[PDB]
RNA sequence: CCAA
């Protein structure tokens, strides 16, 4: 993959490798694709267009500090809001490590299955999951308006209901539709984004061609004269300059081709206020008449559509970030997992024909220079680690004297199920394997004491989606995972069980188990290597890993006689194995019994009668 | 292969 992060091409037509279709993601190496301390997203997703938008909103300080801040309280009902907060917090703390948005994608697919007048907004987003072209037109802008609308709707349903997202994106739109003479009707609705679509009077590129500001002025105050056998006159006007401006560019290809020639069209920064019943936007303050509270706006980021030379379509994200240790603006470009730091002259330049701006974001001046606040800047509510929150009808819950600290030993094991299969297209060129879901996890008390080796959660994860295979032999999940059909296990949602794991790694607990990197990858949570004690890495044999049942029969006297797997018992045996490994390490017998399990396994064929 |  040499010469793949080059974002510039000497030719104005050849698309550089930084925007090409990245190779599909046993252990994929991401070190030659990201050198910065800001993470990328796993391209193995059902949505061809949501990864670019998530990165666009991560670097808006006023939104990022809020949705991450919403992780103080247990907002289990706001699925799309908290899952976005779980993703934003994970992205910030990974500092470059790969991240997956499968949890957010699952909450979006379950929310869009809703079967308000504009309900086709749900169906238009659901129609873009089964993947034909990669992404259609006007579809990224449709989700941009959909994501912001659903977030605000969930923002009013959180604990201590907030309106912070409305104060940032709120566009007080006056919709005057004149039916007859001297008699008109006005509508006032708060819009999260501004839609620049269906432009008719292209009088902008003469002397106001020109820059982007005239397009924003028309979308803020326009008079359309088309409706129906009526052809009514409609006048849309906004009287609000919010903190951030969400722009949705959807123009004609003739207007898109003419807009590439105008150098410096997409303006870096501008200022403007409201003087008349319309909004005026000027480059410098010398053109501003003043007489009102002036507002300064700077570009935060934008999502552009890349048309490959192989006639392939994909989205990328340009991003600016401010460092409080100096006065500097660093640009960042985001492919799926390709992240590079670029210059401003290249980020604003759009003379290339394979580049089309789709979603632009402008931010307030004094608010962009504000630093990003992590979730651990407030007091988080660790009440779920003790409460019994089940959705149905041999462990023991936790107490406040067992309050986990930075270093509390815990044994974790997770069971999963199969929703779909590989479902590939072919040499493989289009499709990828997907759809593995979580069924049951269990955390065990690992701290030495009276309550040692005894679990404290045994939660099963409810799932309404159609499964393809239970993997019952390796999952121990009888068909009782249905919400009203719980056989014997106490069920729980996915948002509640994820918070138990998130709070454990938030405090700094130390997880032990076998193959913990797999569970955390499918649970969709990233834990630092300092808090992971994997028995596979410890008892590693070159490139071969040993089965947990085998180690229980060669390192201990526990012949499990494995029939139906049992996660609560699997995590228990993984805990005491870490205790034996500690014993065999304190006394210098480390690389003496490890060599004993290789050779004894050659004649035994890595198996024992069970 | 491990994980499942």
């Amino acid at each position: 993959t040499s010469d793949i992060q080059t974002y510039t091409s000497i030719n104005k037509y050849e698309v550089p490798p930084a925007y090409s279709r990245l190779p599909l993601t046993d252990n994929f190496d991401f070190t030659p694709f990201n050198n910065t301390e800001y993470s990328g997203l796993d391209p193995d997703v059902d949505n061809h267009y949501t990864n670019a938008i998530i990165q666009l909103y991560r670097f808006i300080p006023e939104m990022f500090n809020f949705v991450v801040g919403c992780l103080k309280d247990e907002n289990f009902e706001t699925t799309l809001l908290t899952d976005l907060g779980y993703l934003f917090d994970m992205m910030e703390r990974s500092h470059g490590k790969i991240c997956s948005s499968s949890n957010f994608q699952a909450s979006l697919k379950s929310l869009t299955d809703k079967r308000g007048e504009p309900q086709e907004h749900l169906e238009e987003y659901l129609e873009s999951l089964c993947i034909s072209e990669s992404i259609k037109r006007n579809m990224p802008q449709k989700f941009n308006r959909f994501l912001l609308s659903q977030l605000i709707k969930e923002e009013a349903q959180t604990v201590n209901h907030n309106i912070t997202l409305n104060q940032c994106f709120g566009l007080e739109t006056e919709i005057r539709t004149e039916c007859s003479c001297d008699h008109y009707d006005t509508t006032v609705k708060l819009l999260p984004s501004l839609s620049i679509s269906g432009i008719n009077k292209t009088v902008i590129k003469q002397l106001n061609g020109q820059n982007i500001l005239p397009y924003i002025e028309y979308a803020m105050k326009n008079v359309t004269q088309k409706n129906s056998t009526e052809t009514i006159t409609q006048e849309c006007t906004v009287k609000n300059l919010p903190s951030v401006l969400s722009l949705e560019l959807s123009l004609l290809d003739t207007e898109f081709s003419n807009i590439r020639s105008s150098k410096n069209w997409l303006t870096s920064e501008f200022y403007g206020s409201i003087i008349k019943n319309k909004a005026v936007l000027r480059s410098t303050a010398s053109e501003l008449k003043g007489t009102s509270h002036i507002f300064k706006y700077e570009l935060n980021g934008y999502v552009a559509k890349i048309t490959d030379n192989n006639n392939e379509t994909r989205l990328v994200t340009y991003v600016k970030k401010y460092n409080p240790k100096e006065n500097c603006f660093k640009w960042l470009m985001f492919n799926d997992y390709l992240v590079v730091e670029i210059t401003e002259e290249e980020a604003l330049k759009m003379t290339y024909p394979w580049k089309t701006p789709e979603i632009i974001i402008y931010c307030d001046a004094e608010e962009l220079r504000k630093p990003f606040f992590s979730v651990d800047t407030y007091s988080i509510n660790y009440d779920i680690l003790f409460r019994d929150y089940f959705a149905n009808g041999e462990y023991k819950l936790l107490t406040h004297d067992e309050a986990p600290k930075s270093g509390t030993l815990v044994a974790i094991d997770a069971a999963f199920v199969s929703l779909q299969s590989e479902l590939c297209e072919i040499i493989r060129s289009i499709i990828r394997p997907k759809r593995t879901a979580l069924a049951r996890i269990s955390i065990i008390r690992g701290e030495e004491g009276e309550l040692y080796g005894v679990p404290f959660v045994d939660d099963y994860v409810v799932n309404t989606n159609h499964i393809e295979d239970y993997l019952t032999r390796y999952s121990g999940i009888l068909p009782g995972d249905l919400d009203p059909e719980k056989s014997t296990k106490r069920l729980v949602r996915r948002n509640v069980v994820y918070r138990k794991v998130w709070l454990l790694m938030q405090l700094g607990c130390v997880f032990v188990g076998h193959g913990l990197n797999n569970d955390f990858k499918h649970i969709n949570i990233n834990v630092p290597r300092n808090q992971i004690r994997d028995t596979a890495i410890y008892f590693l044999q070159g490139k071969r890993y040993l089965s947990l049942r085998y180690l229980a029969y060669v390192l201990l006297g526990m012949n499990i006689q494995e029939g139906n797997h049992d996660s609560i018992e699997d995590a228990h045996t993984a805990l005491i194995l870490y205790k034996k490994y500690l014993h065999l390490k304190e006394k210098a017998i480390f690389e003496k019994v490890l060599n004993s399990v290789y050779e004894e396994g050659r004649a035994h064929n890595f198996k024992v009668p069970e």
Side-chain angles (χ1 to χ4, degrees), chain A residues 1-11 13-25 28-108 110-113 116 118-119 121-124 126-130 134-135 138-152 154-180 183-200 202-203 207 209 211-216 218-220 222-225 231-234 236-238 240-254 256-262 264-268 270 272-274 277 279-287 290-295 297 299-311 313-324 326-329 331-348 350-365 367-369 371-387 389-391 393 395 397-404 406-422 425 428-429 433-434 436-447 449 451-467 469-472 474-477 479-482 484 487-488 491 494-520 522-528 530-538 541-542 544-545 547-548 550-552 554-558 560 562-568 570-578 581 583-584 587-590 593 595-599 601-603 606 608-609:
Chain A
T1 39
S2 182
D3 192 71
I4 203 181
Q5 302 187 20
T6 43
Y7 53 87
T8 166
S9 185
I10 48 91
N11 179 40
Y13 301 89
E14 179 179 66
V15 47
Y19 305 99
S20 52
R21 171 186 280 262
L22 298 177
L24 306 168
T25 46
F28 195 95
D29 189 6
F30 296 101
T31 199
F33 293 99
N34 195 344
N35 298 20
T36 56
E37 50 169 335
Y38 301 98
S39 305
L41 299 184
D42 201 331
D44 193 288
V45 282
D46 308 353
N47 280 81
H48 274 287
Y49 61 97
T50 52
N51 276 359
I53 289 166
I54 298 180
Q55 294 281 2
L56 176 55
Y57 292 151
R58 192 232 96 89
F59 292 91
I60 312 182
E62 212 163 11
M63 156 157 36
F64 174 80
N65 295 300
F66 171 78
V67 51
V68 167
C70 294
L71 299 183
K72 306 173 285 81
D73 317 315
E74 33 185 336
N75 304 312
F76 298 137
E77 331 303 321
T78 68
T79 55
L80 204 68
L81 177 59
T82 41
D83 266 332
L84 179 55
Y86 283 149
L87 177 57
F88 275 174
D89 186 53
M90 182 174 52
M91 290 174 58
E92 176 197 31
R93 67 180 60 257
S94 289
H95 289 74
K97 187 172 182 175
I98 208 59
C99 295
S100 197
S101 62
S102 62
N103 263 25
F104 185 86
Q105 282 288 149
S107 300
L108 185 57
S110 190
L111 172 133
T112 199
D113 290 350
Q119 84 143 24
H121 215 154
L122 284 307
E123 210 39 81
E124 201 63 39
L126 173 54
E127 204 192 340
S128 192
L129 317 188
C130 311
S134 188
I135 184 55
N138 265 75
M139 198 53 59
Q141 304 84 338
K142 276 181 179 179
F143 174 72
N144 172 86
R145 202 185 310 105
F146 170 77
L147 170 58
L148 286 172
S149 296
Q150 211 74 9
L151 279 174
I152 299 175
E154 296 183 340
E155 181 193 32
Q157 299 182 1
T158 190
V159 181
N160 57 264
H161 310 259
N162 306 85
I163 50 67
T164 315
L165 287 180
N166 268 329
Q167 283 178 353
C168 298
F169 292 80
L171 294 171
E172 299 194 5
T173 311
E174 247 181 59
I175 300 97
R176 167 188 293 105
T177 166
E178 304 190 9
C179 308
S180 75
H183 175 50
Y184 57 83
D185 189 303
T186 76
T187 319
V188 174
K189 40 173 165 291
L190 200 57
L191 304 183
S193 66
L194 178 57
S195 180
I196 308 179
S197 176
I199 314 298
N200 195 325
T202 166
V203 202
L207 45 81
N211 37 24
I212 183 185
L213 298 93
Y215 288 88
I216 308 181
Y218 179 85
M220 285 204 175
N222 76 283
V223 294
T224 166
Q225 198 187 125
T231 316
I232 329 167
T233 73
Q234 195 177 190
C236 297
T237 165
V238 297
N240 192 346
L241 284 196
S243 301
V244 303
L245 274 64
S246 187
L247 271 59
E248 297 171 17
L249 265 178
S250 36
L251 318 175
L252 311 93
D253 283 322
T254 68
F256 266 147
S257 301
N258 180 272
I259 211 55
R260 311 180 214 270
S261 59
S262 296
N264 286 89
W265 176 75
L266 184 147
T267 305
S268 173
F270 57 79
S273 54
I274 315 179
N277 204 9
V280 281
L281 302 179
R282 304 294 144 178
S283 305
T284 172
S286 184
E287 299 135 337
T291 67
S292 70
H293 194 325
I294 195 68
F295 294 99
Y297 282 154
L299 212 181
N300 197 270
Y302 72 100
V303 164
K305 180 190 65 179
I306 301 294
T307 64
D308 206 359
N309 290 151
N310 308 90
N311 206 265
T313 56
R314 77 198 88 266
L315 285 182
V316 297
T317 299
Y318 296 85
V319 153
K320 259 208 297 179
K321 193 173 180 303
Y322 187 84
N323 157 255
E326 200 253 296
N327 184 91
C328 43
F329 271 156
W331 275 99
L332 294 177
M333 196 279 295
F334 280 76
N335 204 1
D336 280 336
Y337 51 91
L338 191 279
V339 181
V340 293
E341 173 171 353
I342 71 180
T343 169
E344 170 161 340
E345 196 202 44
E346 184 61 31
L348 310 186
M350 40 190 55
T351 324
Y352 312 96
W354 40 263
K355 197 179 181 181
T356 294
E358 298 266 275
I359 297 164
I360 308 181
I361 293 288
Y362 280 101
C363 193
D364 184 75
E367 208 80 357
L368 197 180
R369 292 133 261 276
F372 295 77
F373 278 71
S374 165
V375 65
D376 202 286
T377 64
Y378 326 90
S379 295
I380 317 181
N381 176 35
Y382 315 90
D383 202 282
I384 298 88
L385 303 182
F386 316 103
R387 188 194 294 105
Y389 197 178
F390 303 118
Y395 61 97
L397 293 86
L398 277 190
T399 58
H400 289 73
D401 42 301
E402 303 190 65
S406 177
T408 307
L409 283 173
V410 282
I412 176 171
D413 183 58
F416 293 90
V417 284
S418 182
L419 304 180
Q420 214 169 324
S421 313
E422 39 163 292
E425 190 200 87
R428 254 172 54 91
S429 65
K434 307 161 295 285
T436 177
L438 175 55
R440 163 197 188 166
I441 80 171
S442 304
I443 327 291
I444 326 291
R445 283 134 171 162
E447 274 292 336
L451 291 181
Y452 180 86
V454 48
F456 57 99
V457 316
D458 199 22
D459 305 341
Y460 287 49
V461 184
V462 300
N463 205 277
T464 64
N465 301 121
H466 168 268
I467 70 102
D469 189 6
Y470 267 97
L471 290 294
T472 326
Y474 323 92
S475 81
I477 303 300
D481 206 5
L482 192 61
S487 170
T488 313
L491 290 169
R494 199 192 76 250
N495 321 88
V496 286
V497 67
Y498 185 96
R499 177 161 251 266
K500 295 186 173 183
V501 185
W502 182 79
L503 295 174
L504 281 180
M505 72 135 288
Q506 154 67 35
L507 293 175
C509 298
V510 178
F511 296 90
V512 307
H514 204 17
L516 290 191
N517 301 86
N518 212 237
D519 313 348
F520 297 163
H522 288 359
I523 292 176
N524 197 339
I525 185 179
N526 270 0
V527 182
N530 317 334
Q531 304 176 38
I532 308 175
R533 305 299 158 83
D534 209 332
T535 50
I537 306 301
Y538 285 140
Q541 328 164 64
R544 204 257 164 86
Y545 289 1
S547 99
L548 184 106
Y550 188 75
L551 297 197
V554 295
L555 267 308
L556 297 170
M558 328 205 84
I560 314 184
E562 288 270 81
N564 280 23
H565 264 71
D566 183 45
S567 76
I568 179 170
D570 192 298
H572 183 40
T573 66
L575 176 58
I576 49 187
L577 210 156
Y578 175 75
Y581 170 83
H583 292 174
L584 280 81
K587 57 231 309 188
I589 328 287
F590 29 83
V593 201
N595 303 95
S596 176
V597 282
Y598 316 146
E599 308 168 347
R602 315 272 200 263
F606 285 75
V608 279

